[PDB]
Amino acid sequence: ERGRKRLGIYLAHFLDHVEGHMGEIGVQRDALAEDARLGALIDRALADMAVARASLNAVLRDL
């Protein structure tokens, strides 16, 4: 369906934002000189990205 196709392209692009943003954090992280608390939050944000990435992959898998 073309409506489903358009939706798929938006989600594909959103997945690109998820993965790309996870790469951004990885690139910027060292220059932050994080303590244990900022690190915990960054890791928590990153794990939440990975869940969202998983759900987006499920959607892209099924159509």
Residues in contact with Ca ion by the rule CB under 5 A: 16
Site for a copy of itself in 4-63 (CB under 8 A): 4, 6-7, 9-14, 16-21, 23-29, 31-35, 37-38, 41-42, 44-45, 48-49, 51-52, 54-56, 58-59, 62-63
Query: C-beta of 8: minimal distance to Ca ion in Å?
Result: 11
Is 34 one of the annotated binding-site residues?
A: no
Measured between alpha carbons, how far is residue 37 from residues 1, 33, 40, 49, 61 in Å?
47, 11, 5, 18, 36
Is 19 one of the annotated binding-site residues?
A: yes
Query: Cβ(14)–Cβ(52) under 8 Å?
Result: no
**Alpha carbons within 13 A on the beta-carbon side of 8:** 10
